Write a protein that binds this ligand. Structure first.
Ligand SMILES: OC[C@H]1O[C@H](O[C@H]2[C@H](O)[C@@H](O)[C@@H](O[C@H]3[C@H](O)[C@@H](O)[C@@H](O)O[C@@H]3CO)O[C@@H]2CO)[C@H](O)[C@@H](O)[C@@H]1O
Length: 491
């Protein structure tokens, strides 16, 4: 392909027109044409085309670049120290992979709550408030909250709030086997989101353009979006505020924070031009201002310009939300993490899977280890005729396979109780029995029934371990719950 020109890919939500203005200035000084393109799914197309026809420079959040660098698609970035000193050190950290810089950092992006001041002068502090607020607003033909549900970037902050995480970080490194998408925190967060949908406070099909149009036309009081979205809100004249995201179970929503970054194609015959453009035209006060005026960048990596932008209270809120969430890893496994979470939310939200099934598959799809055990609890009921008769009785659980007593439990009076959970790692039939110990109390004849208890461990359609408990009186072939009846002999 023809290559005398500098080709740049950037997402269609960002200020590509401003960036083209910077490219026109560079064309004047150098005679080199700059073409800015914004194809759909550029982050996916880049590794396919990177065969010629790839861009010379690609702009995306830093999370994608480890994967690009692992596959040899990116040139190493080696700016002078004089240039490095112009950007915040934590932005360089985001583009450092195996000790090498693999992009230039541009801007820090975090999601915020965006709210309509005319509809909602006091935005909710908690997610838990949102359903009641949606009832109130529905009575006036409006909704409380619409935001993009199709992309896990937008739902993650809530899923993370109470404990969800992608990869545990420990001792300078990410453990790619320690994935946090299937824990109690993730489950609680996704369950909340799904219930909002089930209770008709949000629709499963809401995507980027639907939520943007609803907010910018005054149809919904709130949305969740990044700084790039402020420009179309300005034009719409909605009277809006940008604030901290709502809390969930008292924890902050924790957005994954992206650093918009610019990488150089390892196959580009124009590396030096690309480096000249980025360092001497774009990452200057004038360069970033031209992009930012088209669509806001967020908190920019260039210290000299960020000092001006930090006065903007929308940027203070951005940084407030950024501190509460965290900077995404840049490791190759992030792609798999994201497709995993995307599948989970769409499936749970649409009712294809339960929240537990969705996140269990997400855990594996993200590269977490297959949980290959199953547990069950054997339950006992004791029945005394008199209410308030709290006479205690005890029960034993014996393994026939191992010929020993596993556990004993006590019930005072009428009641149900369970033995502690049994764990199985392999399919088969497991044999136990349960019986009541003789009573110390001479006023009662204990039930002498013995129960045979069989646990069948089988695979379900998906290869997951399943355990079913079947219990019978030792006399019989008929199934029966484990229930003992103690007769009182005294008044
Ligand atoms: O839906 C699956 C999707 O997952 C991965 O995309 C993630 C991006 O890598 C990640 O940076 C983030 O993207 C957001 C940008 O950072 C932000 O600048 C703005 O453009 O919105 C983006 C969210 O739409 O989050 C997404 C996950 O939602 C993966 O890399 C993609 O190829 C894949 O299609």
């Amino acid at each position: 392909h023809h290559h005398h020109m500098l080709v740049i890919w950037i997402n269609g939500d960002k200020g590509y027109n401003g960036l083209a203005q910077v490219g026109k200035k560079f064309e004047k000084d150098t005679g080199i044409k700059v073409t800015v393109e914004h194809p759909d799914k550029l982050e996916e197309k880049f590794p396919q085309v990177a065969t010629g026809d790839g861009p010379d420079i690609i702009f995306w959040a830093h999370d994608r670049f480890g994967g690009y660098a692992q596959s040899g698609l990116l040139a190493e970035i080696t700016p002078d120290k004089a240039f490095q000193d112009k950007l915040y050190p934590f932005t360089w950290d985001a583009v450092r992979y195996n000790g090498k810089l693999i992009a230039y950092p541009i801007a820090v992006e975090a999601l915020s709550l965006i709210y309509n001041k005319d509809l909602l002068p006091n935005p909710p502090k908690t997610w838990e408030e949102i359903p009641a607020l949606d009832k109130e607003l529905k009575a006036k033909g409006k909704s409380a909250l619409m935001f993009n549900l199709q992309e896990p970037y937008f739902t993650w902050p809530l899923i993370a709030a109470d404990g969800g995480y992608a990869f545990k970080y420990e001792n300078g490194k990410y453990d790619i086997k320690d994935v946090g998408v299937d824990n109690a925190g993730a489950k609680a967060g996704l369950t909340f989101l799904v219930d909002l949908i089930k209770n008709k406070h949000m629709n499963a099909d809401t995507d980027y353009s639907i939520a943007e149009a609803a907010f910018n036309k005054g149809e919904t009081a709130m949305t969740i979006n990044g700084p790039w979205a402020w420009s179309n809100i300005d034009t719409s004249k909605v009277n809006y505020g940008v604030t901290v995201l709502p809390t969930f179970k008292g924890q902050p929503s924790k957005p994954f924070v992206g650093v918009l970054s610019a990488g150089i194609n390892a196959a580009s015959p124009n590396k030096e031009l690309a480096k000249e453009f980025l360092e001497n035209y774009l990452l200057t006060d004038e360069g970033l201002e031209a992009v930012n005026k088209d669509k806001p960048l967020g908190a920019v990596a260039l210290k000299s310009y960020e000092e001006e932008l930090a006065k903007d209270p929308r940027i203070a809120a951005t940084m407030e939300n950024a501190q509460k969430g965290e900077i995404m890893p840049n490791i190759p496994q992030m792609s798999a993490f994201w497709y995993a979470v995307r599948t989970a939310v769409i499936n749970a939200a649409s009712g294809r899977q339960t929240v537990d099934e969705a996140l269990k598959d997400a855990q594996t799809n993200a590269g977490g280890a297959k949980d290959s055990t199953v547990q069950t609890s054997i339950s006992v009921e004791k029945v005394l005729e008199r209410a308030g008769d709290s006479t205690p009785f005890s029960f034993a659980l014996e393994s026939i396979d191992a010929m020993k007593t596993i556990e004993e439990i006590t019930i005072a009076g009428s009641g149900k109780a369970s033995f502690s959970p049994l764990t199985f790692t392999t399919v088969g039939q497991y044999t136990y029995r349960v019986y009541e110990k003789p009573s110390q109390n001479k006023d009662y004849q204990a039930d002498t029934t013995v129960f045979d208890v069989l646990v069948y461990v089988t695979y379900d359609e998906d290869g997951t371990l399943v355990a079913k408990v079947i219990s019978r009186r030792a006399g019989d072939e008929e199934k029966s719950a484990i229930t003992f009846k103690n007769k009182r002999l005294v008044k």
